[PDB]
């Protein structure tokens, strides 16, 4: 016997939260300008799914590079969001994107000014009308594609849909996505219940083959088991806190953790539910988006989160935090001490969301809301700038930025059929 330490989650603690600097320009998301482009009159888009293989690498096929977005149709006839004086009130619509969320496709042969597709699944298909978050994995030559993602309201489902990309010289169509399957769903046991918490989360699942055992696993948000407010903020998830920074307050109500699954096979068919990589209760209870990027025989492990969802007593920005560990099952480690990767700018804190760090160091990002002036705003629903960002051991660094949704291939994949 080779004794090895057991695997146990790795806790993002309230002294690791302390650490959070938003002033930090090595990790702050360059400002977005207030005259940004909008890729459709006609639809809001935000969280953003590059096609990619198994193993990670972003995708094209036949030349054509691939996003899946979330999207909500624009209504700027609706009376709902007419204001007192008649006019459309954009802000009220885009707020009420998640309730009506379907998912479409895009397609280039630059990897950026993204031609719309449609929708995915046609009307009816999903057994939930909202289809929410998670990734469209190309499988092989013949183009068949399993789409992962969360059928949200009754409950939150992990789910999968084959069905295939066909392309021609001209664009690219999704075909023969009828059949949605049931993965998992929250336990109650490791991953809080709707039964245990109104507000809890199950989502945004990233599937992926382990470079180091060749088995498949999963990703995905949830929160700690347990009934909403018993919760307790112990020595371990209060941390090595600073003199006077020992009150949790009532932090106790945040409970966000980054969970995994396991497959029993290599077609991402059975799954099971193994307990959580990271656990942030009394530090944030949503840790969004959870993704791999393998570097250095390391596990990079990002997650997107908001200030407002912050540990009572801890703040923060919105956008990607990020842990590194020398093995799957950990331990990590904060990076950059903290955890804080890229940040939003103070002065335009909500200017972008649901960042997607690639393999190639190129992060993604939609267009929330940009200031444009003492009370005035814009709302985007658009690809934002892409920016360039180098993993260095237990540090990252902003490098550059890069045009509005640019999202340049990593492997082209030939697919006939």
């Given at each position: 016997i080779q004794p090895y330490k057991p695997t146990k989650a790795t806790i993002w603690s309230r002294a690791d939260a302390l650490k959070v600097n938003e002033y930090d320009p090595t990790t702050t998301q360059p400002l977005v300008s207030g005259d940004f482009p909008v890729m459709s009159d006609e639809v809001f888009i935000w969280d953003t799914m590059p096609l990619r293989d198994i193993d990670g690498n972003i995708a094209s096929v036949n030349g054509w590079s691939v996003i899946f977005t979330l999207t909500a149709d624009r209504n700027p006839t609706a009376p709902e969001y007419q204001d007192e004086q008649g006019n459309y009130d954009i802000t009220l619509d885009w707020n009420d994107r998640h309730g009506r969320a379907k998912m479409y496709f895009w397609y280039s042969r630059t990897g950026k000014d993204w031609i719309i597709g449609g929708r995915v699944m046609a009307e009816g298909v999903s057994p939930t009308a909202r289809e929410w978050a998670g990734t469209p994995v190309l499988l092989n030559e013949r183009g068949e594609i399993d789409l992962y993602y969360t059928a949200v309201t009754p409950g939150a489902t992990v789910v999968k849909v084959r069905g295939r990309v066909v392309t021609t010289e001209n664009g690219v169509e999704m075909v023969g996505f009828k059949k949605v399957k049931s993965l998992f769903e929250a336990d109650g046991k490791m991953y809080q219940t709707e039964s245990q918490n109104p507000?809890?989360?199950?989502?945004?699942?990233?599937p992926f083959r382990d470079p180091k055992?060749?088995?498949?696993?999963?990703?995905?948000?949830?929160?700690?088991?347990?009934?909403?407010?018993?919760?307790?903020?112990?020595?371990?998830?209060?941390?090595?806190?600073?003199?006077?920074?020992?009150?949790?307050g009532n932090s106790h109500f945040q409970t966000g953790c980054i969970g995994i699954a396991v497959c029993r096979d290599e077609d991402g068919d059975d799954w099971e539910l193994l307990p959580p990589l990271i656990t942030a209760v009394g530090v944030n209870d949503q840790t969004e988006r959870p993704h791999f990027v393998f570097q250095d025989?390391?596990?990079?492990?990002?997650?997107?989160?908001?200030?407002?969802?912050?540990?009572?007593?801890?703040?923060?920005p919105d956008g990607v935090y990020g842990f590194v560990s020398e093995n799957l099952f950990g331990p990590y480690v904060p990076l950059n001490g903290s955890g804080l990767v890229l940040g939003n700018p103070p002065s335009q804190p909500y200017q972008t969301y649901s960042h997607y760090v690639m393999p190639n160091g190129l992060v993604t990002s939609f267009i929330d809301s940009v200031p444009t002036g003492e009370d005035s705003y814009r709302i985007g629903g658009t690809e934002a700038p892409t920016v360039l960002i180098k993993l260095k051991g237990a540090q990252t660094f902003v490098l550059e930025e890069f045009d509005y949704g640019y999202i340049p291939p990593m492997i082209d994949v030939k697919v006939e059929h």
């Amino acid at each position: 016997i080779q004794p090895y330490k057991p695997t146990k989650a790795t806790i993002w603690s309230r002294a690791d939260a302390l650490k959070v600097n938003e002033y930090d320009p090595t990790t702050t998301q360059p400002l977005v300008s207030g005259d940004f482009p909008v890729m459709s009159d006609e639809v809001f888009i935000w969280d953003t799914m590059p096609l990619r293989d198994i193993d990670g690498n972003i995708a094209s096929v036949n030349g054509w590079s691939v996003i899946f977005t979330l999207t909500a149709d624009r209504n700027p006839t609706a009376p709902e969001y007419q204001d007192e004086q008649g006019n459309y009130d954009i802000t009220l619509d885009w707020n009420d994107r998640h309730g009506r969320a379907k998912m479409y496709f895009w397609y280039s042969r630059t990897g950026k000014d993204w031609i719309i597709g449609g929708r995915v699944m046609a009307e009816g298909v999903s057994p939930t009308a909202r289809e929410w978050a998670g990734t469209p994995v190309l499988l092989n030559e013949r183009g068949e594609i399993d789409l992962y993602y969360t059928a949200v309201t009754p409950g939150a489902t992990v789910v999968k849909v084959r069905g295939r990309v066909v392309t021609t010289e001209n664009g690219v169509e999704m075909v023969g996505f009828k059949k949605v399957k049931s993965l998992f769903e929250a336990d109650g046991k490791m991953y809080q219940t709707e039964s245990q918490n109104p507000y809890w989360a199950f989502r945004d699942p990233c599937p992926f083959r382990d470079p180091k055992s060749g088995k498949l696993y999963m990703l995905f948000e949830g929160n700690v088991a347990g009934e909403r407010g018993s919760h307790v903020v112990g020595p371990d998830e209060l941390g090595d806190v600073p003199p006077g920074y020992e009150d949790a307050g009532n932090s106790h109500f945040q409970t966000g953790c980054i969970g995994i699954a396991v497959c029993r096979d290599e077609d991402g068919d059975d799954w099971e539910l193994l307990p959580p990589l990271i656990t942030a209760v009394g530090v944030n209870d949503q840790t969004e988006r959870p993704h791999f990027v393998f570097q250095d025989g390391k596990y990079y492990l990002f997650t997107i989160s908001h200030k407002f969802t912050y540990g009572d007593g801890l703040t923060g920005p919105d956008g990607v935090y990020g842990f590194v560990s020398e093995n799957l099952f950990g331990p990590y480690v904060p990076l950059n001490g903290s955890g804080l990767v890229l940040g939003n700018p103070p002065s335009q804190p909500y200017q972008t969301y649901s960042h997607y760090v690639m393999p190639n160091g190129l992060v993604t990002s939609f267009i929330d809301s940009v200031p444009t002036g003492e009370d005035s705003y814009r709302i985007g629903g658009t690809e934002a700038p892409t920016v360039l960002i180098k993993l260095k051991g237990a540090q990252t660094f902003v490098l550059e930025e890069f045009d509005y949704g640019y999202i340049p291939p990593m492997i082209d994949v030939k697919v006939e059929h």
